[PDB]
Design an enzyme around this catalytic site. Structure first.
Site, PDB file in Angstrom:
ATOM      1  CG  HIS A 134      69.523 -12.106  52.935  1.00 50.70           C
ATOM      2  ND1 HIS A 134      70.871 -11.929  53.216  1.00 50.70           N
ATOM      3  CD2 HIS A 134      69.049 -10.975  52.355  1.00 50.70           C
ATOM      4  CE1 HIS A 134      71.157 -10.691  52.841  1.00 50.70           C
ATOM      5  NE2 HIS A 134      70.094 -10.077  52.317  1.00 50.70           N
ATOM      6  N   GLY A 137      78.110  -6.831  51.820  1.00 46.06           N
ATOM      7  CA  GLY A 137      78.073  -6.344  53.192  1.00 46.06           C
ATOM      8  C   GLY A 137      77.171  -5.136  53.406  1.00 46.06           C
ATOM      9  CB  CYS A 176      72.494  -7.075  53.074  1.00 44.61           C
ATOM     10  SG  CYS A 176      72.854  -7.741  51.424  1.00 44.61           S
TER      11      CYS A 176
END
Ligand code: QTL
Ligand code: CL
Lengths: 302, 297
Positions: free
Chosen positions: B41, B135, B137
């Site tokens: 993503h 942040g 991820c």
């Protein structure tokens, strides 16, 4: 979202753990630059533990009596000195993995991460708080002596604790990295008991603010309290007195949530009176006191 | 003595964390050998969106060093960025997919920099009750077996209830989740029964015996009670796994099950076990043995 008991990443400290052997005793050392720091009780024998004269035992030791092992490499001890209850072994190699570091002495209520080690090898990392009675409720077995407590604020490791002993109740005692013990403890087998422990009130309030930030408001109430009335109630539940410093420290969380410190104190008073009633706060059925106001802000905002 | 929620030492994983920037999105990557793994993503028809991307669109930063991306491919929900430099800090590693109930350590990162390490468990509903902000991820979950890091998780998203969802290092999501902003809800969670029993054994090893009783139970009677309290079924495999702890404490697994059955039907009664007023289920039987015996890495 979410609230976890979070330890600092332990890498910078792992690269400092070494094994220190002296006679039949083996424990952990902290290798920073060309010095290995470890508990001075490594120089103790069987009958020299009830009342050891460390100055006398150290004078009889030579550099080659201390075997320091960093991984599969034996380091050469070229000097030894004692500073309070810590032994400092000067070595012939500066640790290439030496991080930017400081020695900081903490106050009760402060949290830190512990890198539990056995034979100079890290086994695990966990988060702790210096109890009001100066003990730590750690997780340590025989051979864990020399394991260190630290904080990693920014790129600098602040060493605040070195494990020395386990008290009869299973709690742990130790020193700062200058060898000064936390609490009225001494490094000998003499009868020593931890004082009656109390709850770190400012930390519970910080954790209640963390719960509000995470959407948990059920424990909030329409009441406020005076600082004195809160402390009179708090003392009865074996909670530490909340000082004006603690109120000031909780200011940023009070501003972020819109709940005045004395307003949150009235929630804490109500929780102490009623309990939880089958409910939880941040997945806990007890009031958590091992998160400081600084921990809450860091974890909830960055 | 002492029993703490203990994570694996995170050093071997810290030497792998990098920052991956693509357009306006910045998250974490895992640099192993000459490949950087991160959630796809960072770039929906991901094949179509990826075809429009060139290697120079991905800015990978390892500390203060910019790595050059020389290739990109997708494997399930993970993006693999081939880089020019093999990570000199690459540890001995494996990609393993874990089962619900198994535990792992999470190295929470922001902008390729590790900020914290915590221990958690893959819930039976395939979510993790983590601690993550925007942040995070690309932050990874792992275990350490001897000197080998087994990467088992990569963080992708937070569900509306505040719980987290992610994939193994091959990009296969844990649970019925998808990497898209849509209505997704975690299923009803259950308690990891074998882990609660492991934690009761840890309490006995630490001197907490108040909950022990003279009684035993059949595996079937225990599971009938356990199902009623939203507890996972205890299988014969779980009983066998708890064998060493049963031998060390002298409390048969079905004997500990009778203690658990009473705790479920009657509560703690103002008492605590290992400083907790709830039954802890995020310590596996191996975690308990590792901590109550001092295994090192
Ligand atoms: O406490 C010590 N070690 C330990 C440390 N942590 C957890 C343990 C668990 C089980 C056995 C030992 C443990 C150390 N050896 C025992 C006696 C003693 C007396 C005085 C001093 Cl200063 C140190 C020591
Ligand atoms: Cl402090």
């Amino acid at each position: 979202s979410g609230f976890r008991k979070m330890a600092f990443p332990s890498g910078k400290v792992e690269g400092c753990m070494v094994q220190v052997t002296c006679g039949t005793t083996t424990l952990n050392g902290l290798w920073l630059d060309d010095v290995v720091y470890c508990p001075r009780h490594v120089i103790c024998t069987s009958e020299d533990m009830l009342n050891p004269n460390y100055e006398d035992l150290l004078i009889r030791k030579s550099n080659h009596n201390f075997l320091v092992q960093a991984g599969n490499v034996q380091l050469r001890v070229i000097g030894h000195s004692m500073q309070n209850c810590v032994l400092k072994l000067k070595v012939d190699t500066a640790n290439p993995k030496t991080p930017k570091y400081k020695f900081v002495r903490i106050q009760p209520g402060q949290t830190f991460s512990v890198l539990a080690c056995y034979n100079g090898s890290p086994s695990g990392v966990y988060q702790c708080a210096m109890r009001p009675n100066f003990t730590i409720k750690g997780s340590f077995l025989n051979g864990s002596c020399g394991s260190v407590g630290f904080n990693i604020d920014y790129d600098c490791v602040s060493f605040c604790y070195m494990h020395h002993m386990e008290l009869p109740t299973g709690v742990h005692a130790g020193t700062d990295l200058e060898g000064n013990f936390y609490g009225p403890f001494v490094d000998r087998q003499t009868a020593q008991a931890a004082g009656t422990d109390t709850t770190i009130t400012v930390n519970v309030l910080a954790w209640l603010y963390a719960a509000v930030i995470n959407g948990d408001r059920w424990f909030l109430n329409r009441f406020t309290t005076t600082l004195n009335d809160f402390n009179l109630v708090a003392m009865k539940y074996n909670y530490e007195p909340l000082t004006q410093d603690h109120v000031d420290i909780l200011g940023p969380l009070s501003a972020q949530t819109g709940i005045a410190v004395l307003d949150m104190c009235a929630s804490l008073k109500e929780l102490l009176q009623n309990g939880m009633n089958g409910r939880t706060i941040l997945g806990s059925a007890l009031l958590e006191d091992e998160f400081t106001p600084f921990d809450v802000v860091r974890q909830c905002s960055g």
